[PDB]
Amino acid sequence: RYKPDWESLREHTVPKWFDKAKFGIFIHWGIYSVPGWATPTGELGKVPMDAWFFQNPYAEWYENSLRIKESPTWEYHVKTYGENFEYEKFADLFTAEKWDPQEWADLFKKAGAKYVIPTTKHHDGFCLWGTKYTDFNSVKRGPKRDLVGDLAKAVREAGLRFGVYYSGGLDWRFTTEPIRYPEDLSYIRPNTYEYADYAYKQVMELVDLYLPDVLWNDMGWPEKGKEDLKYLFAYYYNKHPEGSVNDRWGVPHWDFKTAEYHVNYPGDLPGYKWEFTRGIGLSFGYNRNEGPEHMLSVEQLVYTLVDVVSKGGNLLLNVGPKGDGTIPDLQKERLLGLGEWLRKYGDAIYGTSVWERCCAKTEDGTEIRFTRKCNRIFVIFLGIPTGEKIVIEDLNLSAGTVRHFLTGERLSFKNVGKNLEITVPKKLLETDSITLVLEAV
Amino acid sequence: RYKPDWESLREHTVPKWFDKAKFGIFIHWGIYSVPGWATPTGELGKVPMDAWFFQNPYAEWYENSLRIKESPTWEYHVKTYGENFEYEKFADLFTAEKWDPQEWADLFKKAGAKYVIPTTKHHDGFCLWGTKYTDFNSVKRGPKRDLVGDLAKAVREAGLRFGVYYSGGLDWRFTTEPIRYPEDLSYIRPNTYEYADYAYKQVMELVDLYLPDVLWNDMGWPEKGKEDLKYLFAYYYNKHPEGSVNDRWGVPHWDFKTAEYHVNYPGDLPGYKWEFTRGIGLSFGYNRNEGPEHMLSVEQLVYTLVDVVSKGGNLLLNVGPKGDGTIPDLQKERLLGLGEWLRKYGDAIYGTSVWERCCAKTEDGTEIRFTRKCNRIFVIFLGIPTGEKIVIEDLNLSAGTVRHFLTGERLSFKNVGKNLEITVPKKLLETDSITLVLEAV
Amino acid sequence: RYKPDWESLREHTVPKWFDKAKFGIFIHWGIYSVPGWATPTGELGKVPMDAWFFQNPYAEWYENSLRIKESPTWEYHVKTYGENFEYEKFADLFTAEKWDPQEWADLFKKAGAKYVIPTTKHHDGFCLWGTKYTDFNSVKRGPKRDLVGDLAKAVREAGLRFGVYYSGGLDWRFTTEPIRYPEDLSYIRPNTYEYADYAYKQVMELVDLYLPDVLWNDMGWPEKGKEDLKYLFAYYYNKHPEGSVNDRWGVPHWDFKTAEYHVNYPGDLPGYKWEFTRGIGLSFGYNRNEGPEHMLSVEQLVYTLVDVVSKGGNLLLNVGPKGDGTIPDLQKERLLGLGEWLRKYGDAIYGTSVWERCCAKTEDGTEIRFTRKCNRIFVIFLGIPTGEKIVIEDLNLSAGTVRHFLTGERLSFKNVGKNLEITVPKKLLETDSITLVLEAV
Amino acid sequence: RYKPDWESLREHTVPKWFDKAKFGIFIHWGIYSVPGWATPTGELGKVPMDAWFFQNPYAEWYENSLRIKESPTWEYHVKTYGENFEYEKFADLFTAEKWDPQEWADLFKKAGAKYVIPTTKHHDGFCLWGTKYTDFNSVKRGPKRDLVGDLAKAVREAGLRFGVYYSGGLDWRFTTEPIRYPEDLSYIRPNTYEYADYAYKQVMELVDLYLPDVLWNDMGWPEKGKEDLKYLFAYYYNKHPEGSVNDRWGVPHWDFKTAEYHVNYPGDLPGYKWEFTRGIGLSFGYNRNEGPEHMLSVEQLVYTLVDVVSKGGNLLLNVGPKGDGTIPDLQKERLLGLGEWLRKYGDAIYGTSVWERCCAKTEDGTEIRFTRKCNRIFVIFLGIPTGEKIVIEDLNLSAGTVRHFLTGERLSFKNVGKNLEITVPKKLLETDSITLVLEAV
Ligand SMILES: CC(C)[C@@H]1NC[C@@H](O)[C@H](O)[C@@H]1O
């Protein structure tokens, strides 16, 4: 039994399933997916923040962008939907006509994912379940359906874990002015006791209805409601000890940390569980303006995943579905591509632990990542060397055997000074896909 | 960009327009203006506080007075409207049948005023704009009109600044017991988190709808809502840096202080901007029981204004209109009288600064006030001496010239010991109105 | 770098060396060791708390007991040292004339311990290092020696980790009234800002002088100083990431929990690292009145360690040295005995992890505990069965090889229903010592 | 009287003398001035902060640098003074044998300064007055003299205002670990209630002994002592209303803001009084390694002052004296040079106000700054144009007379489009020094 106080909640550590999962699917889906439009400006951390909100590459920020007159979104909206078309009207157009939760679940499973987390309420405040605290929801409007619950049921029947994303820190139904600068986030927030109660009642509602495996909050938690989390976390863990909580609440407790390119991404081994998140594209919500050139290739997804995992993290990859419930082909192809790689190399990923070091590189610059399972060390090349002779810089092994992972073939290697040389027959090199993988015992 | 914290908000100083304005018009108008009745007991600070609330001279406190059985208001009400007539019923009688916002604006402008501030919500909680947070408002009841917005538009078209008064500290729709003693104010207040949210949402609403030049709160701010003001003030100033806030919030920040006879009235020069407020009569809301004997004369208004200004303050003069929207003749005549004096002497008032001292008096007791504009010093007599020889006590001038302000005529004067003697030709003395004014360079 | 806030400090998890150490030695030593006397009443949780402080079995509480007149301690003190001998005078008799820190360290190492933690300051406030914050210390009085520093050097020379115990919660140099009842602890505390500063400064000094591997506070941290720990913990971890802190500070952070018979002792597997502590006898400080009847036998010590380890904990076993610095024979014998068992079976203890369950028992009630190392599961019997046929209740092994641990001999086994039968030749059983140990892969 | 609460303290605004002073002299002087050594790396905001503390260009940070072994400072110290020479020993070498406070004051006055502020205590905690709170001060050690008091008398004899700098935020007499990275500042602080008392007591003592015209704190105020400032500020203002405080306390109140190149430097007109500070060179304390290459030229100093003044600020220019109390020639030359320009053009600087805009430039890019005195607008060119025809971009004058400032000669000008043309006879241009100055009425 957990008690409602930070010192007692510290007894809850990240559950084993999460630590072993390594790969999950994020889903940003809502009424913003209907217009599904943003200018693909660039990546966060690379686009200047004095312009970011004025040319926001996140399609799910459509409403905020629309509130900024003459932003590209405003022009687009006016020309496409007209001035007499309020954002909320998109809830009636969000019909999810072609949604099939079992197909989604089957796809996520085939992609190699072990948990799924959809946006139950994003910044626009629209709720994707039949909440009793607002009528701005999927059961009363557009879909006429409990999207969260129906997806939960499908994800679980496919054997995957199910978490929930909730925008606790922002809700545009409680503010009128848009965020134009990063600094506006320090004061343009709901700010009321009423909003703190609402956020508390809704996350408790999600806990009671769906008992999620992960509570993924975003944008911090209302300051007036922070003390409520001691009770909410105890209430939650006492009903589901294997549940978990991310680190975006702004209180002392969390089970795992979160990182993005610009924030908290480690260069080497941290001593705590974390999770890296990013979209297949530059937006989280569907953006019809994105082409393959704005997306990671299957190879980059694999490398991203390997890097993350070798550093002790899980990858939470975001998918942005359309308003009709379909997953765009460009995204689906990248998911299947990753799932194929995982079906071959999954044993060197799932259930692994970090090694003594995460990283190395060859003499000719190919990057290498390591993962471990007891006595077995997985050596994962981000790429496949062309020549059979391979020199890994600054590494020596006290193992007695190095095998080619996929074929299981013993290989010849020797510590040559401060480096490690391994001979990989070209036949073997040709059997690998995207990554040459070795196994040392 | 202002940040939501007291130290950063300190960077916002009183805007120049307010400092230069000197004279504004307060308007206490609401459903209490229909019965428009109070016993004209006396001035605040002069009437004993153990009786004040039982024989309240403020007609806008009608509801509170009515809740005190057998107070004069209760007797009056029962005899006039009857016991089966609840105070709220006055909202349906408040029809503002003869209201013309442009006439009001024209009158205020002719009176010499530079800003106007109406009660958007007084203690009775009735709102004079179409707020979405209560149906007890002017758009839904009586007037069927947005009084605040329509007046805002007129005041601005006449070139005047527009502020809003809001009763943040008291709202009788949230309490049942009347205030009978000053000490009752320490505990008979809304007190709930709900009320703090409401006050916050309504002032933010006024900011978003009308973007006022002044936020004039009264009776303090709900304790549970004080931290909200850091955000509200930043939000406000970032949309209108030339806006301003009075000092009745009970938090660290304010742009100017407020004073009344009994409170904070300076005797000499303070080092900060302030504003003196009082009604033309003894009430703020219309009181049909007041006669000329309960009101300041045009002369007393002028003297009051001069004294205030010479001490660095602005005068915020209150007008109490009738339920039909007309301004009673006694008040209108006093406003025009003041406006006439200002049209002649305005250059020695508007845009001035305090001098080294505010005050002096003649050998025969006539009071004198000073104001300044760079090298010009205005010497304003509260009255017009009868003899041509004038001896100002304890004053010497290092100027090289003293002129009669209205005619511009050079005058003969000399420092005679510790006094100053000036000869003012009787012809000149006869050209002045209410105040003999001199100009020294 | 760690930051001074609980959220950031949560990133520091229990260091891997502590997790793997399993066994440490506690040392309560101080001026109270000179009289070294207490009435050996019983185990905590077994003695009525209405009498506990009056017949305190803890010799280190001598001073508090001495302050309760007519306690057995007061009678003994008066008769032995005299009514005029003030407790503090024991600091002049605490000479540690026969102390050899290298001998202690070698004994602790032979005992099988991996870390050692002496009392740097217990409740009587006497400090065993040359602290600059009080003259009541071992450098200025008694030993004329830095005992903590010399012990630290020796323990480290021996290859063991070194931590410090500090009585943050109690310091009788700041109070005059004794603790008579449990409830007295809620208010007979130093209570001042001065003491909060003093505790902070002394632990900071311990960190700067000795950079201990464990900060083991006792009796809570002064309330006025709790916020300081955010800074102390960050400072400490930033200088020594592999350092650790216990859970007796009363703030949100800790790396491991502590338990005693009556407190926090788990029945099965908790999800966090914890540590069980108890003495060899009934007191922590040396008690000349204890004989073998009041101490655990070597067998009981082994069973204790095994049970704690099978449940994820470390055993922190206390030694109470005499005033001359020697360790009594009865304690030294039990230490060497435990050390011989660990030399034989250490591989089933050190560096292990918990299995799916901690416990089981045979058909004739012999208790069994499990520990794990990757694929190897160690089955430790709390005792040595007499017959070769062994039936383990409610246990089935999906292993494929069960071996006698000491000889490595393969054994015959079979999952018979909900049980597991195993035959162990008596010659193998006769080779074991105190515990039969099997190994399953 | 001012009251001890932020709301009441807000009544105190920046004193008129500070607003008009425009230029003051900062003095970093202390025991660190004896070694007077640092590696002149670069300007703050220009040097990478990951190396900053390791190659600190600030000689006054000698002690912190000395605590980082293998810093250039440590190498220099060992070779010059010896490994056994503890930093504190510099207090015995700080003799100020050639110090003449009257000479310093006269130089500061000739330099054109109106106020002077010496370091009473910098981060090393050494106090330059006979404080009763520590023996580490100039009366008991080194100079055997009250330097702050003798300097105060001299500065005032010279007719200048006198303030005090105090390192409230840092005191290395309360810490042992050096600051290596910016982040270290969040926790390597005194942190105790004792230090909070100490800082309060010392500033109170400075107020009581010297009643300074400015309290210039640095590095924030200890968190546990922030509430004390309400009382300290009231106490101070009630004894000296014309006193002032800077903005580095971390509490709601301040009279003026402070800025440095990298911090708070305005691009145009802010609405509050502020002050720019920087040294003549790259260090604040004397650095024997700096030559003319690391210092501002007289021209650059003038351009600096003018720019800061046209934007509403005061320039607080730092001088770093040697350990013997003399001011190095290179700094004295630049001071006298600036003083000669102010003797010629001071009327366009002292007692001025900002105009409608601070800035403009000529067609060939000469920068121009404006200042104002009632009707007189001063047009200060940052340089002296070579040809007589001058075209000012985007400027139109509704004046009627433009005169050469130095000679008073009336000049020919014309608003030509969005620009202003002016002809300035070369004989007038040749009469100017460093800056061409015009005057428009
Ligand atoms: C990382 C991801 C969850 C993003 N968090 C910040 C949000 O503003 C954005 O829409 C998206 O949800």
Ligand SMILES: CC(C)[C@@H]1NC[C@@H](O)[C@H](O)[C@@H]1O
């Ligand atoms: C000064 C004026 C604004 C008065 N403030 C106190 C109120 O109770 C009263 O009705 C009136 O508004």
Ligand SMILES: CC(C)[C@@H]1NC[C@@H](O)[C@H](O)[C@@H]1O
């Ligand atoms: C467990 C052990 C460290 C005990 N803690 C409580 C103290 O009062 C007692 O003397 C002993 O140190």
Ligand SMILES: CC(C)[C@@H]1NC[C@@H](O)[C@H](O)[C@@H]1O
């Ligand atoms: C601006 C000046 C007063 C500097 N403030 C920061 C200090 O660390 C530095 O030594 C110097 O005093």
